[PDB]
Design a protein around this ligand. Structure first.
Ligand SMILES: [Ca+2]
Length: 356
């Protein structure tokens, strides 16, 4: 079998004498280890800085050495064996971290948050406003491109999520947009009526296990050919502070976003419709709650779900929608299909209107 390199373990910046460990496999009959200025293709790559003193572990999958003097700033690190060669990108200094995706912009305290990005090595802190994450709850993938943590006590309002490493800081603005909440079953909005609907406040012992105060459940047995079953018919508070959502914002740039916990997986058939301010003519139909993060239903975990506001409202600006008569936020579950019966158990909270 041919050698390969999975990763290189080292502390930054890499100075003369800094220990490195090449992690991979099949390091049999090593003939040379060297840094090269060549990238992408190492055919006839120069031996820019050779490593003459190194050790290999018992399973031939880890090579240890101290950085030679005169180390290149960037290029490739190469292990040349009898069979073939393996190489990996190398640079002496850390790049700043970056964040590409977050599992939710409003994670519930106590739940697990997932972040995708790059260069998560040597984490110093994870912060959100005036809150800081307990680093004992953090797990980082081996490729330093994914991490999880436990959401701490909630921030006081819209802030930046920030991951700080020894290499720098990555920031996500617009995090925890409490000012944009239109219905939370606590201080904002109210439940009006609905079949199969009951309020729930979690305490750790039963689904949804954690909750932001009161949430509402839709649950029960949903038969086949059921055209009227579960509803959450709610009064929402649409008067978001203009400092957090300008009046002239295009509705094409906004989403209705909420948290959803699906406790029991269900098959094809059951669907939700959503409509606002009684405008059934512009309802969004055939909806299955799926995570913005994964694109799929994540059974047993709170998900963030977004629906474009332009799929729900006739108005072209946020202010014009605010001026429309009424206040309702409605969700209705049916099963217009031959399939079933299905046991349903789902929870909803923290409806907000936010920019996409
Ligand atoms: Ca709530």
């Amino acid at each position: 079998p041919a050698p390969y390199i999975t990763r290189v373990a080292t502390t930054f910046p890499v100075e003369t004498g800094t220990p490195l460990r090449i992690v991979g496999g099949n390091f049999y009959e090593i003939q040379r280890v060297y840094f090269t200025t060549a990238v992408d293709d190492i055919t006839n790559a120069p031996v820019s800085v050779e490593v003459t003193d190194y050790t290999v572990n018992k399973n031939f999958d880890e090579i240890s050495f101290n950085a030679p003097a005169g180390l290149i700033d960037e290029g490739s690190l190469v292990v040349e064996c009898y069979t073939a060669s393996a190489f990996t990108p190398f640079r002496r200094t850390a790049l700043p971290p970056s964040i590409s995706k977050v599992s939710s912009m409003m994670p519930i305290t106590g739940t697990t948050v997932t972040v995708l990005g790059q260069n998560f090595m040597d984490i110093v802190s994870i912060t959100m406003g005036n809150r800081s994450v307990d680093l004992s709850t953090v797990t980082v993938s081996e490729a330093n491109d994914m991490l999880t943590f436990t959401m701490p006590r909630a921030p006081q309002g819209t802030c930046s999520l920030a991951i700080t490493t020894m290499g720098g800081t990555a920031e996500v603005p617009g995090f925890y947009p409490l000012e944009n909440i239109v219905l939370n079953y606590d201080n904002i909005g109210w439940f009006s009526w609905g079949g199969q609907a009951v309020p729930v406040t979690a305490d750790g012992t039963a689904a949804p296990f954690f909750s932001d105060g009161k949430c509402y459940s839709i649950s029960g047995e949903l038969s086949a050919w059921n055209y009227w079953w579960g509803q959450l018919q709610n009064g929402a508070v649409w008067g978001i502070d203009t400092a957090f959502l300008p009046t002239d914002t295009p509705t094409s740039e906004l989403a209705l976003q909420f948290e959803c916990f699906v406790a029991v997986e269900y098959g094809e058939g059951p669907v939700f419709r959503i409509y606002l301010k009684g405008n059934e003519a512009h309802n969004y139909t055939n909806y299955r709650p799926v995570s913005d993060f994964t694109g799929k239903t994540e059974v047993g975990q709170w998900m963030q779900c977004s629906i474009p506001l332009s799929e729900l409202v006739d108005e072209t600006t946020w202010g014009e929608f605010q001026k429309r008569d009424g206040d309702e936020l409605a969700l209705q579950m049916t099963n217009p299909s031959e399939n079933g019966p299905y046991n349903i158990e789902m929870y909803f909270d923290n409806f907000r209107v936010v920019k996409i």
